Ligand binder design. Structure first.
Ligand code: HEC
Length: 88
């Protein structure tokens, strides 16, 4: 689950979120704080909130709804939440 999410992450996310940052929008990192400050519902269900932004995305953040499977999405989400909580 988290090991799978790691692979989905480096194959589809590392390009912009290397080390849990945000090369495009500097202040929109994948840190615990940022995910809390900007991700709706994050403080309700962390993985679900991340899985949401991943499926739909916004602005410069592309959606993966057609490219990734629901399973691959829940996996990268758990991985991200895991990394945020651990500090990357
Ligand atoms: C570069 C083109 C990106 C790729 C490919 C992915 N993401 Fe992204 N992400 C990007 C931007 C420009 C932004 C911010 C957009 C905005 O204005 O809101 C984001 C944001 C996120 C977030 C929330 C970050 C925060 O506000 O703290 C999440 C949860 C996120 N991105 C996850 C993520 C994952 C798992 C990806 C791989 C499938 C991924 N992103 C790819 C730009 C880019």
């Amino acid at each position: 689950d988290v090991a799978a999410g790691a692979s989905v992450f480096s194959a589809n996310c590392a390009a912009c979120h290397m080390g849990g940052r945000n090369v495009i929008v500097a202040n929109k990192t994948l840190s615990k704080s940022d995910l809390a400050k900007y991700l709706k519902g994050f403080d309700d269900d962390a993985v679900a909130a991340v899985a949401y932004q991943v499926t739909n995305g916004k602005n410069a953040m592309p959606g993966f709804n057609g490219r990734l499977s629901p399973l691959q999405i829940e996996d990268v989400a758990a991985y991200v939440v895991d990394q945020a909580e651990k500090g990357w």
